[PDB]
């Protein structure tokens, strides 16, 4: 047999080309490897986590290096509103002179890409000013990643390999990660904000050569000890402060203003310093809750085991199953990555980033598609847990036993919400389509979104005139009668009641229909994933499904036919629904913001209530300069996005070959090619691995990969080129 792969002896004896593909797709599934003891599993995961950490630090070190080497960071910080950030230089020797002239842009003297990731706005706020600042930051992460590569190699050495009881210590980890990873790092980040980022915002250079001399405050460190902490809430910043200069600047380092800095249109650095200081000491307090070595502290299994009439065994279910933990942590990370996307556009934290419209569109779509991917992997690894790690006797009559007995009620209730939302949202859209087409656009059914308009009034919008409970001046939620200490509010209400920002935008009847279509996409994608997880151990069509694994093709054409019956194929089906849902989300965010940024917010309001308006005025109207990136009239700077646009349409179409055509068509075609090669003269090659068609599961995965790459490269090219050419 072959030596590759070393982790699967049955794949080594595979004589076909299936050996090479299945060795890739199972290379990081350590539990199914040959002779993997359960303690050796944790040590290889721990060293793989150090390898992933070093890749992350090398990635940001390369972003900092290429901006310092080929970008325009020192030229961009002069006027960030009239300049354009440069990502890196272009070296493509197939370029012609019109392509060289088109990408010699943003005041550069060579072909460059325009940065759309926002790292210029992020480094400028935290105090980077020179390319020498970005270089030593790139060198420091170049050595920090090599420390991560050392610790992965070190904790695989026999003296430094941790035992299993160290890995299962869920109290010493949860204390150290709350207080050290979440608390001390948020404390040290406040220490960077008040020592470095706040003086560089006020014209004072603070580096490693002069930070031991310059205090963060004129009253240096004495108001903290004497308990007069209000001496850090000094003159905060004037309304005429210019970022990076000393004119109009204050001395305060911890303030409670709220709202936005008026020039940069972003959050105050003093509100962000008092944020991470309040977050730090709360997380350091929270990291002193559980007992490890000293008697004091709670014990996590006692709160779970003494919780019934239902959480008995839930500790040991969590602590012993890595797939339960992975599915739990992907769900928490998936909610947060949505929250990062929803809050970074509404409350922009980086200086002048709210006026870089292509960056705000790129950053929202990035973190929403990341969040949708972590959400479907939370359910996927929660389904691998129910097949591999779930013990029905260790979890008898607890909550995990309840839903597996309740599974026909959960799926049927998810199906009704899915069918109700789909019948009535598509019914309202097609009705409005037929009314506008037949010349009667006022016969449209335009349901006003009264629940989220009143929710906007309860947050501070007086735009609807309903004047009640924080849309109210003399409310008890506004005045804060026992305190009168809501310092946030007078700065907050200028963020809500201005028309140029992007928190609590005005919603109308076209906003209600798309929020219900988003709710349709959330409920169906959950319905595919929950039904795939709850039927993963078995159904009445296939009662012994847990002995077939997470991923298998089918159970054959008998019993009616069993195509796409495994829990893996419910992940495969929900990925189409996740992309379609996140398609509907980012279409709505982009079309609403393209209407707000152009001042044509009215034109969104008549056209978003029927589906031709999305087709004509969003898809067709914004494609005009994208597909003119090259033409017989010439080429311009949108040519790489026009080429990627067709590239994405091509990968999406290659996907349909793998998803519509199935295996035995291709397997019988390969036999005729194997006939033709054996009987052709002068063709001295011969396949060592026997050519077979791709397997049933593999081409569902290959077809989903081409679908996803075709989905993202199409919209990502359309999002960049339509936003950056209009603005």
């Amino acid at each position: 047999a072959t030596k590759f792969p070393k982790f699967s002896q049955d794949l080594q004896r595979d004589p076909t080309t299936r050996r090479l593909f299945y060795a890739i797709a199972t290379a990081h599934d350590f539990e199914s490897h040959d002779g993997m003891s359960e303690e050796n599993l944790y040590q290889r995961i721990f060293a793989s986590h150090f390898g992933h950490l070093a890749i992350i630090f090398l990635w940001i070190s390369g972003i900092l290096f290429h901006v310092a080497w080929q970008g325009n960071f020192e030229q961009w910080i002069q006027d960030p509103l009239n300049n354009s950030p440069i990502a890196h230089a272009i070296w493509d020797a197939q370029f012609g002179p019109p392509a060289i002239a088109a990408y010699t842009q943003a005041g550069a003297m060579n072909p460059v890409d325009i940065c759309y990731s926002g790292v210029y706005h992020w480094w400028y706020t935290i105090g980077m000013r020179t390319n020498n600042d970005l270089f030593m930051g790139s060198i420091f992460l170049l050595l920090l990643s090599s420390v991560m590569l050392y610790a992965g190699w070190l904790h695989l050495q026999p003296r430094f390999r941790p035992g299993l009881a160290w890995f299962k210590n869920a109290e010493s980890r949860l204390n150290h990660h709350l207080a050290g990873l979440f608390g001390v790092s948020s404390l040290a980040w406040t220490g960077h904000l008040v020592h470095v980022a706040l003086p560089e915002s006020r014209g004072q250079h603070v580096g490693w050569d002069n930070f031991l001399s310059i205090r963060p405050h004129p009253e240096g460190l004495a108001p903290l000890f004497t308990g007069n902490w209000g001496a850090y809430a000094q003159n905060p910043d004037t309304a005429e402060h210019a970022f990076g200069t000393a004119q109009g600047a204050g001395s305060a380092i911890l303030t409670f203003l709220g709202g936005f800095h008026p020039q940069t249109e972003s959050l105050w650095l003093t509100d962000m310093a008092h944020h991470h200081l309040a977050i730090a000491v709360i997380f350091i307090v929270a990291g002193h809750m559980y007992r490890t070595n000293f008697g004091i502290g709670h014990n996590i299994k006692e709160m779970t085991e003494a919780l019934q009439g239902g959480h008995k065994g839930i500790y040991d279910t969590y602590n012993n199953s890595l797939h339960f933990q992975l599915g739990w942590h992907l769900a928490c990370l998936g909610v947060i990555t949505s929250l990062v996307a929803q809050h970074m556009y509404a409350m922009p934290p980086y200086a002048f980033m709210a006026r870089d419209y292509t960056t705000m569109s790129a950053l929202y779509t990035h973190h929403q598609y990341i969040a949708g991917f972590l959400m479907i992997g939370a359910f996927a690894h929660g389904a691998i847990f129910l097949i591999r790690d779930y013990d029905p006797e260790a979890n008898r009559d607890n909550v995990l036993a309840r839903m597996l007995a309740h599974k026909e009620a959960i799926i049927s209730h998810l199906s009704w919400v899915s069918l109700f939302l789909g019948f009535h949202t598509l019914g309202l859209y097609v009705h409005n389509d037929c009314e506008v087409a037949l010349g009667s656009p006022e016969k449209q059914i335009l349901i006003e979104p009264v629940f989220a308009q009143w929710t906007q009034a309860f947050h501070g919008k007086a735009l609807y005139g309903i004047n009640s409970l924080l849309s109210n001046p003399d409310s008890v939620a506004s005045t804060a009668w026992p305190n009168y200490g809501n310092v946030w509010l007078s700065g907050w209400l200028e963020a809500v009641n201005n028309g140029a920002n992007s928190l609590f935008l005005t919603i109308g009847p076209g906003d209600l229909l798309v929020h219900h279509a988003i709710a349709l996409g959330l409920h169906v994608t959950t319905l595919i994933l929950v039904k795939g997880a709850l039927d993963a151990r078995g159904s009445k069509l296939m009662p012994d499904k847990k002995d077939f694994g997470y991923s298998f093709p089918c159970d054959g054409p008998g019993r009616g036919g069993t195509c796409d019956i495994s829990a893996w194929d419910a992940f495969y089906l929900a990925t189409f629904w996740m992309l379609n849902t996140l398609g509907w989300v980012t279409f709505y965010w982009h079309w609403k913001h393209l209407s707000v940024w152009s001042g044509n917010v009215a034109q969104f309001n008549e056209s978003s209530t029927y589906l031709m308006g999305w087709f004509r005025d969003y898809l067709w109207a914004n494609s005009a300069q994208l597909i003119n990136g090259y033409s017989p009239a010439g080429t311009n700077s949108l040519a790489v996005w026009a080429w990627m646009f067709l590239f994405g349409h091509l990968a999406w179409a290659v996907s349909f070959m793998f998803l519509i055509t199935w295996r035995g068509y291709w397997q019988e075609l390969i036999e005729t090619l194997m006939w033709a090669h054996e009987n052709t003269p002068l063709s001295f090659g011969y396949p060592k691995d026997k050519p077979v068609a791709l397997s049933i599961v593999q081409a569902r995965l290959v077809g989903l990969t081409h679908f996803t790459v075709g989905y993202i490269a199409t919209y990502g090219a359309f999002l960049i080129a339509s936003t950056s050419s209009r603005f």
Binding site: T16, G556, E671, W675
Partner: protein, 80 residues
């Protein structure tokens, strides 16, 4: 190779043996059902995994189960 398991709910109807195109299955005497015979899978290294035997099994649920295992040249059905 694949794994063909015969469970004790088998009524000995010989229909999986008739359905198998690879002659994997045969009947052995059992005295565990009325027909006195049960299915067995001696030549399971010739099994291609077509699951024609499970399509032929009248017992609910099936007395014969095929588990797709390591792919060999015989189990992949390759004439080349």
């Amino acid at each position: 190779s694949h794994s063909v398991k015969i469970y004790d709910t088998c009524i000995g109807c010989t229909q999986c043996v008739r359905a198998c195109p690879l002659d994997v299955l045969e009947m052995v005497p059992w005295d565990g059902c009325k027909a006195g015979s049960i299915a067995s899978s001696p030549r399971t290294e010739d099994c291609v995994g077509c699951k024609r035997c499970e399509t032929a099994c009248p017992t609910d649920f099936l007395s014969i189960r095929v588990y797709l295992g390591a792919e060999t040249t015989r189990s992949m059905g390759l004439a080349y």
